[PDB]
Amino acid sequence: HMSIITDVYAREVLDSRGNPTLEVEVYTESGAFGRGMVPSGASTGEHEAVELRDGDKSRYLGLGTQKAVDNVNNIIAEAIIGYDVRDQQAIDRAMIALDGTPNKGKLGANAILGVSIAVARAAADYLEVPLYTYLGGFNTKVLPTPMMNIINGGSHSDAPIAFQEFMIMPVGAPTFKEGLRWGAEVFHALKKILKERGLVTAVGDEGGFAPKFEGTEDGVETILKAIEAAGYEAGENGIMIGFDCASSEFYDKERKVYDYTKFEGEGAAVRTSAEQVDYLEELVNKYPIITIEDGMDENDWDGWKVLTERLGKRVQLVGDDFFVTNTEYLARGIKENAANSILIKVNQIGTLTETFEAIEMAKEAGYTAVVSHRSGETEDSTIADIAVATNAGQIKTGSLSRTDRIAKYNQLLRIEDQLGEVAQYKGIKSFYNLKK
Amino acid sequence: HMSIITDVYAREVLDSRGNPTLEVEVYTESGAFGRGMVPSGASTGEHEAVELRDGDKSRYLGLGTQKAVDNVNNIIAEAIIGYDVRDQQAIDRAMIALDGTPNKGKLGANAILGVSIAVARAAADYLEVPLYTYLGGFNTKVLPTPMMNIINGGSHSDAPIAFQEFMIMPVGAPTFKEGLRWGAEVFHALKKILKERGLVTAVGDEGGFAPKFEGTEDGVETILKAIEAAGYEAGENGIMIGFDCASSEFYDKERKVYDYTKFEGEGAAVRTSAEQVDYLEELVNKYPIITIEDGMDENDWDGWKVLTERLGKRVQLVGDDFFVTNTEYLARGIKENAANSILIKVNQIGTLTETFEAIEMAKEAGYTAVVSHRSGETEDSTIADIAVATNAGQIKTGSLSRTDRIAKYNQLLRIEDQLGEVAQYKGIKSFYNLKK
């Protein structure tokens, strides 16, 4: 019978921005095909995947991938035989299982995830259901409600922007083609203002700017005066704002304190979780905002034991690296009731089956799981299309400018080129943690 | 190359108390063998991984488990297809990373432990050696001492005993072939005095009697006075004393109060993070308490920064359902240093591979790791193979008067009779929390 996956392998090249990669392929006895791959990068001492490089200095600083690929290669294949192409979930599990290290450090979760996404495109020329519809069944009409960081700060930056990011959620628009219009183009009106101001207009690595203001409090006036000048009102009338007032980045572990001299000048504020809270609550009165991301720190679980009676029913607090996507920190998170939202990043979990599992376990409880990026994207769509796999809520898939981001945002309306009138989504009324 | 797990088969079963649980058989090309069945019973509020229950009336009550093996049958086996039977690292991590859910609810923590036990026997049904001597290497030779459920309290009786059990070690016996009996000749001397006083001699689910002792006096004190009358001497030259506490159940969550009235009657008291050890400090000087167990609540963190510094240099603080075995809670209790032994419960940690990793990591943190009972247990010897495998100095093996406890020694003494000479011995010098 022609349904079998017969042979599996991976190859040796560079990712976008040009650092080495670990890249994976799927084929069938029927002749149907798919490549599958990953975002690039991780930390240490925290529950993510493991990044593995044979340190031989002759090429690209010694950051070559060959340790993994010449381990991985014929080690994946000897597990994966006697299966269909629709045997996705058995395949996904079987390669984490084959790695058999608790930290996913023999194959790397980034090789396992490679075959996972590769099988999730390979029945399409055989069943005639794509990707998300293949995974989830017939429900999957729904383009997600989106968000982006066009205004960077934090760990990645030359800017004063001590928030790790200034963000928008273009929620207040009844069709995805009306979130992707009312203020993403307005980044070029910002470019005209930056040129008039005499500032630089080089892009940040998400596709946005790290704009060189005299301080981060001018970007606070910029967006809600730009939308006022666009002829529309800073409420449900178009768009709502997010921040990443980056708790884990301004937190000092030794002093137990959020101190902004991490990013800012000689006079910058020193705040424990209690000064940080007795500051932060006001942002729903001030000039309105709907969201913050990494609202309290990865170590500052006590800061999350502050935040519920204080901000909890006023703002969406996205636990981003506060959870590092992970189902273990999330499963602690909901029992301790730490945050009210989570960011979900595919190599911080390690298979399609684990990514949809985290999103569904969050959806049956009510935690707003935003399926999402890392700064390193690849020549793939699939990190975005997991947002269609259940209709859940919301997505964070990078800035509207980069080719490796357009490889998702093109898909997020090329689906609508086939679906047309069949597409629908939830609006501002998508924050299934808020307005109850 | 007759080396392979060709097929493995979960099978439906009853358990003790007269309900159901899960069992497994590994078959092979060689006709070689590996059954696995599990210890039964679990706890709540603090994490334990899933046991599965159903709406069925046909295979017992609705606590019934035909269910798990009404559907799990075709799942677990294929993740291990074409594998060598040995590699329990790459094979339990494979069945763990076949469930993948954070609470292990797809397969169930009874299922992954069942196939883990099956694969363990099957791995020496290849390696030919006496399997416990695989689990620890050949050097399964540094002999542990018992501690046990000598006097009743908690769930099992009318009796006013808020202590989860009182405890001792036999300490004066120069070799374990006496040292087991020199903790057990005690028990028949006690039982004769129970008949004479008119106390009951029927046994509970925990294999001790259901007596009616009054708090800390005559029930334990008959096992003071015996180690004088029996010709043994008043301490280490003899038997030495200890307590265990139902702390996280008698710790009232509204009053922040230890209140004994759940398990005691009208003689009960009222205490906090403080006054619990303003009481217990006066006691270890008075009864020779070489051990206290589970003394303080899960969330009473100062309760452990009290008991582990207000007394714990004179006492082994065994954490138990403070820890619930879980490696995450154990890592917090290591980092904050909240106990100086851990009671380990096999089904609180989901597989023999994760039981072995938990026990190894526990001695690397310097804790006496103490493997221990649940409430109903099935006649597979493999959790007794964990005794000879571990080479430490202590086990909470259980009272020598019920069939689930007796069944360990049909393995340990028949292993011992194969070797004779191999032992290095402890008795009292049995801790890594004393004589520093």
CSV table of N, CA and C in Angstrom, one decimal, chain A residues 78-79 81 83 89-90 93-94 96-102 327-329 331-332 335-336 354 361, chain B residues 45-47 78-79 81 83 89-91 93-95 97-103 106 328-329 332:
chain,number,residue,atom,x,y,z
A,78,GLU,N,15.9,4.7,11.6
A,78,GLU,CA,15.8,3.4,12.2
A,78,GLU,C,14.6,3.3,13.2
A,79,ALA,N,14.1,4.4,13.7
A,79,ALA,CA,12.8,4.5,14.4
A,79,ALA,C,11.6,4.5,13.4
A,81,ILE,N,9.9,3.6,10.5
A,81,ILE,CA,9.5,2.7,9.4
A,81,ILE,C,8.2,2.0,9.8
A,83,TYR,N,5.1,3.0,9.1
A,83,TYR,CA,4.1,4.0,9.4
A,83,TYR,C,3.5,4.6,8.1
A,89,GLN,N,1.3,11.6,14.8
A,89,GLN,CA,1.4,11.8,16.3
A,89,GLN,C,2.3,10.7,16.8
A,90,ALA,N,2.1,9.5,16.4
A,90,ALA,CA,3.1,8.4,16.6
A,90,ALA,C,4.5,8.8,16.1
A,93,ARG,N,6.0,11.8,18.5
A,93,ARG,CA,6.4,11.2,19.8
A,93,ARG,C,7.6,10.3,19.6
A,94,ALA,N,7.6,9.4,18.6
A,94,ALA,CA,8.6,8.4,18.4
A,94,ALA,C,10.0,9.0,18.3
A,96,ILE,N,11.0,12.2,19.7
A,96,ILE,CA,11.4,12.6,21.1
A,96,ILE,C,11.8,11.3,21.9
A,97,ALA,N,11.1,10.3,21.7
A,97,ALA,CA,11.2,9.0,22.3
A,97,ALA,C,12.6,8.4,22.0
A,98,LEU,N,12.9,8.3,20.7
A,98,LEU,CA,14.3,8.0,20.2
A,98,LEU,C,15.4,8.8,20.8
A,99,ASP,N,15.3,10.1,20.9
A,99,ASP,CA,16.3,11.0,21.5
A,99,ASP,C,16.5,10.5,22.9
A,100,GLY,N,15.4,10.3,23.7
A,100,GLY,CA,15.4,9.6,25.0
A,100,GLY,C,16.3,10.3,26.0
A,101,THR,N,16.8,11.5,25.8
A,101,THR,CA,17.3,12.3,26.9
A,101,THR,C,16.2,13.3,27.3
A,102,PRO,N,16.1,13.5,28.7
A,102,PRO,CA,14.9,14.3,29.2
A,102,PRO,C,14.9,15.7,28.7
A,327,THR,N,4.7,23.6,29.0
A,327,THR,CA,3.6,22.9,29.7
A,327,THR,C,3.8,22.7,31.2
A,328,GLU,N,5.1,22.5,31.6
A,328,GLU,CA,5.4,22.3,33.1
A,328,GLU,C,5.2,23.7,33.8
A,329,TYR,N,5.9,24.7,33.4
A,329,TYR,CA,5.7,26.1,34.0
A,329,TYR,C,4.3,26.6,33.8
A,331,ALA,N,1.5,24.4,33.8
A,331,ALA,CA,0.8,23.5,34.7
A,331,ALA,C,1.0,23.9,36.1
A,332,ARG,N,2.2,24.4,36.5
A,332,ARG,CA,2.4,25.1,37.8
A,332,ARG,C,1.6,26.4,37.8
A,335,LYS,N,-2.3,26.3,38.5
A,335,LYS,CA,-2.6,25.9,39.9
A,335,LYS,C,-2.2,27.0,40.9
A,336,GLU,N,-1.1,27.6,40.7
A,336,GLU,CA,-0.7,28.9,41.4
A,336,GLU,C,-1.5,30.1,41.0
A,354,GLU,N,3.0,18.4,20.5
A,354,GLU,CA,3.2,19.1,21.8
A,354,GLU,C,2.7,20.6,21.8
A,361,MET,N,-4.8,22.4,26.1
A,361,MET,CA,-4.8,22.4,27.6
A,361,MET,C,-5.0,23.8,28.2
B,45,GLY,N,-4.0,17.9,45.9
B,45,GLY,CA,-3.6,19.3,46.3
B,45,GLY,C,-2.2,19.7,45.9
B,46,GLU,N,-1.2,18.8,46.3
B,46,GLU,CA,0.2,18.8,45.8
B,46,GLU,C,0.3,17.7,44.7
B,47,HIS,N,1.0,18.0,43.6
B,47,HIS,CA,1.0,17.1,42.4
B,47,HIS,C,1.4,15.6,42.6
B,78,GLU,N,4.3,0.4,19.9
B,78,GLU,CA,5.0,0.8,18.6
B,78,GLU,C,6.1,1.8,18.8
B,79,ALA,N,6.0,2.7,19.8
B,79,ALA,CA,7.1,3.6,20.1
B,79,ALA,C,8.4,2.9,20.4
B,81,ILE,N,9.2,-0.1,18.8
B,81,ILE,CA,9.3,-1.1,17.7
B,81,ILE,C,10.8,-1.1,17.2
B,83,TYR,N,13.5,-1.7,18.7
B,83,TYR,CA,14.5,-1.4,19.7
B,83,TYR,C,15.0,-2.7,20.3
B,89,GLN,N,16.8,4.0,29.6
B,89,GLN,CA,16.9,5.4,29.3
B,89,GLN,C,16.2,5.8,28.0
B,90,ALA,N,16.6,5.4,26.9
B,90,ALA,CA,15.9,5.6,25.6
B,90,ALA,C,14.6,4.9,25.4
B,91,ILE,N,14.0,4.2,26.4
B,91,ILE,CA,12.8,3.4,26.3
B,91,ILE,C,11.7,3.9,27.3
B,93,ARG,N,12.0,6.9,28.8
B,93,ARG,CA,11.9,8.3,28.2
B,93,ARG,C,11.2,8.2,26.9
B,94,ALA,N,11.2,7.1,26.1
B,94,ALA,CA,10.3,7.0,25.0
B,94,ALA,C,8.8,6.8,25.3
B,95,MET,N,8.4,6.1,26.4
B,95,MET,CA,7.0,5.9,26.7
B,95,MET,C,6.5,7.1,27.5
B,97,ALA,N,7.8,10.2,26.8
B,97,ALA,CA,7.7,11.0,25.6
B,97,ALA,C,6.9,10.3,24.5
B,98,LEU,N,6.0,9.4,24.9
B,98,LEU,CA,4.8,9.0,24.1
B,98,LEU,C,3.5,9.6,24.7
B,99,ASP,N,3.4,9.6,26.0
B,99,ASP,CA,2.3,10.4,26.7
B,99,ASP,C,2.5,11.9,26.5
B,100,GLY,N,3.7,12.4,26.9
B,100,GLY,CA,4.1,13.8,26.7
B,100,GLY,C,3.3,14.8,27.5
B,101,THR,N,2.1,14.5,28.0
B,101,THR,CA,1.3,15.5,28.8
B,101,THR,C,1.9,15.7,30.2
B,102,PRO,N,1.8,16.9,30.7
B,102,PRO,CA,2.6,17.3,31.9
B,102,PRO,C,2.2,16.5,33.2
B,103,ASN,N,0.9,16.1,33.3
B,103,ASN,CA,0.4,15.2,34.3
B,103,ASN,C,0.3,13.7,33.9
B,106,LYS,N,-2.4,10.7,29.2
B,106,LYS,CA,-2.7,10.0,28.0
B,106,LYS,C,-2.6,8.5,28.2
B,328,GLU,N,10.6,18.6,40.8
B,328,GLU,CA,10.5,20.0,40.9
B,328,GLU,C,10.3,20.5,42.4
B,329,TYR,N,9.4,19.9,43.2
B,329,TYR,CA,9.3,20.2,44.6
B,329,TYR,C,10.6,19.8,45.4
B,332,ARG,N,13.2,22.5,44.7
B,332,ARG,CA,12.9,23.7,45.6
B,332,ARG,C,13.3,23.4,47.1
